[PDB]
Amino acid sequence: GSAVPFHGAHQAGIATPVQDRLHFAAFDVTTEDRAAFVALLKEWTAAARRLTAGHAVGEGAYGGLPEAPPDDTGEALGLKPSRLTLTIGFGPSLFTRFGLADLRPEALADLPKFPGDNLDRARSGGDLCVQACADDPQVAVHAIRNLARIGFGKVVVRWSQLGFGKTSSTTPDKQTPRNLLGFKDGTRNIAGTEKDRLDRFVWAAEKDGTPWMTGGSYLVARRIRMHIETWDRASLQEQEDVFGRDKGEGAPVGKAKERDEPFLKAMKPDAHVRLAHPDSNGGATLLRRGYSFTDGTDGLGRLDAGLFFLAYQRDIRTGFVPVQRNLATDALNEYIQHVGSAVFAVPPGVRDADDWWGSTLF
Amino acid sequence: SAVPFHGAHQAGIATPVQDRLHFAAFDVTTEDRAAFVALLKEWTAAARRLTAGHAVGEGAYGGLPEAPPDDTGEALGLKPSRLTLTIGFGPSLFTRFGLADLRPEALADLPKFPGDNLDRARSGGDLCVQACADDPQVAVHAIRNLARIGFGKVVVRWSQLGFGKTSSTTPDKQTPRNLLGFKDGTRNIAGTEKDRLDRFVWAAEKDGTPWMTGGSYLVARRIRMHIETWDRASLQEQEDVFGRDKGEGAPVGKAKERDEPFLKAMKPDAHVRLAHPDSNGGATLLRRGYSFTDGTDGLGRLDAGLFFLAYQRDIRTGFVPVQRNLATDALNEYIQHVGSAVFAVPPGVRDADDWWGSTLF
Ligand code: HEM
Ligand code: HEM
């Protein structure tokens, strides 16, 4: 229930241990005034400092003037910080505004079309995003709600996604969570303690070509539906062949323990692990940080289920893009469909109490 | 960490309220009574496993490679998490299987209420399973696997996820707050109050339906909050709507949350004043609802509210009179009922040989 420090060279919520809940919101900007947008970013940073410490925004949730609406909507009163992190990102469409055209990073690449894509344009894209993660879903909603409230008239929520449970791990010393297909998900990721691998694969560097992005990262979000009726009638052997690890232990095929290293030549040539492994992609390595979702029924008598896939990387062109291209023949494709997509440049961290979100860009 | 599955009553009504909810309504697609009874027994066997934290059937792995696993496996490694599974039967079930003359009179159809805006697709249902647990993945796994076991005899009609408190960080003493920011649950029937449960919650033999003795009647309402409107109201407007202050949740004029309210100090259309048993001839409800937030709608608004659940001994003397009295509730400006269902919740599964619905079938 403790707090995660908000200030740093990097934004929290990436290398941070993965919290239980997610509320992800994408915003479009509705103001033409650069000064007004900068004032928004400063007000948002002040609110974030309160929220991530477990305090109410502004002058608080009650005890103010009777005739005024309260500064804070109040539904997190008496709750702990709950490891809340707030991570902001900037979408490519943002750079068509405020004269930012020449500051768009080369590494913030539009994704190509992939075979099987069925992207809903209403739940894709966005000028910016806020990723709220916490162990308490009410804490995460309270944070998104109050940020959107503060931004009234300057931003509007384009789409959002709640994740009821994590399907990722940055802490390999703790139990790996399972996704809704029943497999452990997160075994071979990047750990928050692997500072060298984060430098190599996650954090943007000044020499990469965009100095305002130094210390930041790039985010790919993909909303993926799971065909669970189809999956649930597949044999156990079929399911394990699809991934290349057994279902119970999560060990690489042939081996006894989850964390034993995969021997890829023993997996089917279209096994998901074989195709996604860095060794199959010229070393390309991602930080996966996704969550499971379910949004009711599908209207056809079935549960709706999916995975909200989030990947952080130093350069979209050398992280997600090569790996996802290599998944064109993935055996998993029979059981999933990508139905939403968005990319964002995640700026560097808020260095101290005088700093603010996006200050290196604006 | 676990709640016993067997008893005179079904768990999940008077037992401690867990952090998360997955509520599912099912429709029945078989006409064959024997097929439906077979499913009730199979579901009961699965519920026994699930509430003890075990996988269904012969498990999630280790079986024949050429067969699908009995359990879909996403709760492997998790704890029981105080999972309870509570089954209920909808009025529409009684048009099947020759049961028409066995519908309880206390299982009444609800009247239309001023301001109803019910989505038919998220209303009704032949039966329900309320899955409550501290870990939402444990709850989802239970619904997912019951639906799979039932495939061919039942389909899922609608499903709702909900959250209350997070107990690993919030004292069990503390009243949870709803998404309007007010403490919610202060004056409620507690599961410790065995006499009030007998008077207001559990169906009795003399009530007129012997197979329902020890059961209860459930009203479910999906209530949307108009969040962005509410958040633009003044603090005084918000407190006037309920009759309690927002910080402490004390009734107007008193100092502490648990002070008994003085109804005449509240505005005449204040929510607490209209809902109170003294304004409804003594009618008293067990509320066991959960908050929800499903995302944002096409206009950018928060799709959020209260998945209201009330248990009572008779729908005609519980939910209906109180909801009728809310016709003029000041809160009506900020909420809209968009989904509705009622269920007869049978008595408990008495031992390892008993099964869900045995007193009815
Ligand atoms: C519903 C969609 C997906 C499911 C169910 C899924 C499932 C899994 C599972 C069970 C593992 C093995 C355990 C682990 O090391 O994490 C894994 C590994 C991995 N997956 Fe996926 N995955 C999905 C989508 C994706 C996508 C879209 C990508 C990238 C575009 C991806 C990239 C990876 C990578 C890089 C690994 C680690 C491979 C290694 O280094 O051993 N996954 N996935
Ligand atoms: C979004 C919808 C609703 C909200 C936000 C809400 C909120 C509240 C709040 C804040 C209280 C005061 C604290 C407490 O004793 O729990 C309360 C009391 C109560 N509410 Fe509501 N309520 C809602 C809908 C309903 C409905 C539909 C009913 C019944 C049909 C109902 C019946 C009651 C009752 C019986 C009390 C106890 C009053 C007393 O005896 O003092 N509520 N509610």
Residue numbers in the entry:
A (entry chain A): 55 to 416
B (entry chain B): 56 to 416
Give excerpts from the publication.
Herein, we have chosen to use an extracellular dye-type heme peroxidase found in Streptomyces lividans and referred to as DtpAa. Heme enzymes catalyse many essential reactions in biology and understanding their structures throughout their reaction cycles is of high interest, prompting extensive efforts made to obtain ‘intact’ structures at high resolution. A major challenge is to obtain the higher valence states of these proteins, for example peroxidases (FeIII resting state and FeIV intermediate states), as these states are phenomenally sensitive to reduction in synchrotron experiments caused by the presence of large numbers of solvated electrons or other radiolytically produced species, generated by the interaction of X-rays with the crystal.
Serial synchrotron crystallography was carried out at Diamond Light Source beamline I24 at an X-ray energy of 12.8 keV using the same chip and translation system as used for SFX at SACLA. Following each translation of the chip to bring a fresh aperture/crystal into the beam, a series of 10 ms exposures were recorded using the PILATUS3 detector in shutterless mode. We first describe an MSS experiment series comprising five dose points with a dose increment of 32.8 kGy (MSS1). The initial resolution was 1.78 Å with only a limited loss of diffracting power/resolution during the 50 ms of total exposure for each microcrystal. Notably, the iron—water bond in MSS1-ds1, the shortest out of all the SSX structures, is elongated compared with the SFX structure.
